[PDB]
Design a protein around this ligand. Structure first.
Ligand SMILES: O=C(NC/C=C/[C@H]1O[C@@H](n2cnc(C(F)(F)F)c2)[C@H](O)[C@@H]1O)c1cc([N+](=O)[O-])cc(O)c1O
Ligand SMILES: [Mg+2]
Length: 213
């Protein structure tokens, strides 16, 4: 029994089927109160929602599905016919994410790709009927943000105006990626400051009164 399975089961038991907002709220409650997990969380999530709404992307790529929190967050805001592709190298995570999406009623909008980016990015256009991406959400291993961006470019998946949106550029940090995009004339960058997810961390003092030998 893993933390991720506990999160899914919590959702199935507490959230309302076919209600994405309910699913997000259940995940957030569980991770706030019971076990920290690396979901983007509500604070950063509200910023994501505002960016998605602004750009109204027809085709989004997510790198890093985890438990499907951001996939639910993004897919619930997609217009009819728009698609989210989400890449997850861990097959246990990919299965949890599919179940989370199913529970939320968002399965028709989302395609889970189970594999490594080095294999899957070059197969996107041919296997998943993609021309160029409107938006990319980066939230996988932090050392993979830059090499994957470069691979996306190599493969012709970026067009003028493709929006990349990257989580965790402060904590844990993505320093090569951040320096690269901020220094490149090929990118125009904006920073949205917020807070790391679920950081009300409990600690305590123990008092121990000696009673003698
Ligand atoms: O390490 C963090 N995230 C790593 C998240 C990694 C997730 O992305 C998947 N993946 C890996 N490669 C691919 C692909 F697509 F390329 F194939 C998909 C991994 O299996 C995992 O589910 C993290 C850590 C903290 N923190 O505070 O420690 C806070 C956060 O918000 C975080 O995102
Ligand atoms: Mg993250």
């Amino acid at each position: 029994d893993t933390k991720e399975q506990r999160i899914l089961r919590y959702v199935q038991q507490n959230a309302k089927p076919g209600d994405p907002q309910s699913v997000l709220e259940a995940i957030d409650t569980y991770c706030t109160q019971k076990e920290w997990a690396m979901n983007v969380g509500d604070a950063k999530g509200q910023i994501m929602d505002a960016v998605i709404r602004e750009y109204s992307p027809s085709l989004v790529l997510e790198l890093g599905a985890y438990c499907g929190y951001s996939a639910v967050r993004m897919a619930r805001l997609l217009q009819p016919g728009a698609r989210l592709l989400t890449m997850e190298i861990n097959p246990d995570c990919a299965a949890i994410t599919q179940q989370m999406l199913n529970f939320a009623g968002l399965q028709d909008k989302v395609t889970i790709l189970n594999g490594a980016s080095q294999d899957l990015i070059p197969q996107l256009k041919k296997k998943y009927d993609v021309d160029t991406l409107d938006m990319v959400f980066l939230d996988h291993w932090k050392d993979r943000y830059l090499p994957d961006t470069l691979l996306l470019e190599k493969c012709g998946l970026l067009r003028k105006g493709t929006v990349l949106l990257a989580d965790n550029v402060i904590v844990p940090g993505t320093p090569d990626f951040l320096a690269y995009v901020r220094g490149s004339s090929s990118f125009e960058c904006t920073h949205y400051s917020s807070y790391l997810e679920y950081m009300k961390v409990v600690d305590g003092l123990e008092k121990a009164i000696y009673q003698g030998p």
